[PDB]
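Go through the following before class.
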Amino acid sequence: IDPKRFGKVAVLLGGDSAEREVSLNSGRLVLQGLRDAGIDAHPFDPAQRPLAALKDEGFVRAFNALHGGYGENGQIQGALDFYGIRYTGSGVLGSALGLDKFRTKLVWQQTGIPTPPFETVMRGDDYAARAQDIVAKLGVPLFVKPASSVAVEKVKSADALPAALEEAAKHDKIVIVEKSIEGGGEYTACIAADLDLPLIRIVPYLIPCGLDAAKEAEFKRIARRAFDVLGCTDWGRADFMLDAAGNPYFLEVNTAPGMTDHSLPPKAARAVGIGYSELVVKVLSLTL
């Protein structure tokens, strides 16, 4: 794994967004991580420098250490594709779709990645027909919310649901109707190439996460399936929760995880004896 098979590497850090400082700190650590492994890596701040200078200066690849704005929403990914520059994290579709919480859940639910159950209704639909089918699938009580401030309406009886769909659709073109579920723990699965990273339990944090080895293995596999259906590369976090019976429900992905000393992927890696430098190289290797 000869460093320099990587060629000239740009670390994208800084940017225009509100998280500029976290990006700057995170990027500097990534840069040092790459240099410790003998990789020819250089900082590149797209807020300070024209993006076309990447191609003009002979950069072949980029480690994306940006957060927020154009860094994670498909914009910089599309631009970098345009200039022939390879980059860590996911492409245009996976990055854009990953930020779109609503459409991520639609893709998941249609493909059998478990996610909190729900149905959608639009202005003009046959509310009586949709109500009957929704009650059959989801039971009651149900929560009605716009899909794009507003309070969640709780609907307690099958018979009252048509009217709630009618009333919600007057204000919002698209409405989600969600099943009632009990919170039974929140968790995150870090994915970094082929590395075996342990789950983390979030306590509003914890390794070991407190799940048994069979469940840990099963949830990590589902996490990778959840990335696959979105068109995401294997770099990121998948957040999920359990109900009281221990069933998993996936909530969202993050395709641009933190890389500060206290961020989750370095913490997970440390927990199983994997150092910061090894982590960053493994992430960059996905661009080879």
